[PDB]
Subunit: 238 residues, 2 copies
Amino acid sequence: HMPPEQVLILLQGAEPPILCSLSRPYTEVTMMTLLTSMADKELVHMIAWAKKLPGFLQLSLHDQVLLLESSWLEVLMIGLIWRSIHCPGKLIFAQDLILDRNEGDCVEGMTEIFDMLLATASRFRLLKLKPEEFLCLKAIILLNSGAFSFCTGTMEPLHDSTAVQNMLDTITDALIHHISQSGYSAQQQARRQAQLLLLLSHIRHMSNKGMEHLYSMKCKNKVPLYDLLLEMLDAHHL
Amino acid sequence: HMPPEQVLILLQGAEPPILCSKLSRPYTEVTMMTLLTSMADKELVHMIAWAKKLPGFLQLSLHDQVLLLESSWLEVLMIGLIWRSIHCPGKLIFAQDLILDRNEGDCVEGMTEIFDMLLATASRFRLLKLKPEEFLCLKAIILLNSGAFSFCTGTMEPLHDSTAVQNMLDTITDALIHHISQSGYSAQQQARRQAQLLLLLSHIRHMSNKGMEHLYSMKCKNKVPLYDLLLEMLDAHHL
């Protein structure tokens, strides 16, 4: 594996450029325009960010697309949470778009999604999540050797799970190395590593529950964000 | 914290008994669902009783007990099913007397994809040589989710006592760490093994998510009632 101190330099050097989006107060339709436009903007930066990771481009297009399609909103969420680590009650969707929690009230069902995200941002702050740990955790979210799809009536895994696993072990080795260098005891190193990886599975859980809540908002009040996100996945052929 | 060696004996002592179903083969779309719901309800009954045997579960409020069980019920079902099938490639041990071959899922459209998704993770169990002690820890960690919540009432509702569940969670993760340290691994292999297992737990949660979303899709596409049957199963147990 590539040495861990260099992995962290590569990851930091591959971070997407700062984003930028809009008249307040937001209505139901302006907030939809807000959220669907930043999702598209950060996806385009996500696809470019992934191609910068070592070994990602030597994968088949199929495996590249499967990895991105599996983790896109999970990557979207961890970055949004990480940008809001230091503004309790606020969510920084972009550098010109930081929304107070109550601003989601114009869309029925959106405020509880914000609360979900805001609660994990507070957990980020309580854990004192370091910038190195955020970079590793976000890359681990993408490099899921267990990724698969049902979209064709047959369970379709990766063409090369072992290659994705090789990249996964590289990142996880780098995470363990950084924690070993952050002045923790042997016991606290193992515990923190456990907390951070359990933090990862919660972000995955928030992705399911959020998209599932967006679908119920579609059925209940015709909120179209669920459809806009799915239609966005098609325009990028995911 | 209860010492880890005591944690593993409690977890072993709290394991549900071996389960059995006796319908005749071959199964059709109707019999497969009587089969799957009968075991799911039986498994859920034994999980609820299993949850009550862990130290600290009963001191939680009913709200936190119900939320913990409601958030993890299928993840707990799936990890146990995969764990029982760790030594029979191509087969899923639903019960002692209920061992389904992979192609027995062809009887219900969409079910074979779930079987393959389950069959793949069981192969990784075998690849990682998952130990009994690790399965017991991971299963309890699946239940003791200090970050569980619900959107049922139009508002984000977390646990009443996130700290208490976290104290229970940290007890199990410490025991898992302690068991890995006793399994003859080097310090480097210990930290790696720890990461492989907790990521395995993440895949199981993803597996629970994808499984139910596919079941709902099978309801919308071909009216396969399993999604509604399971959900009605969850009402009868108040969660």
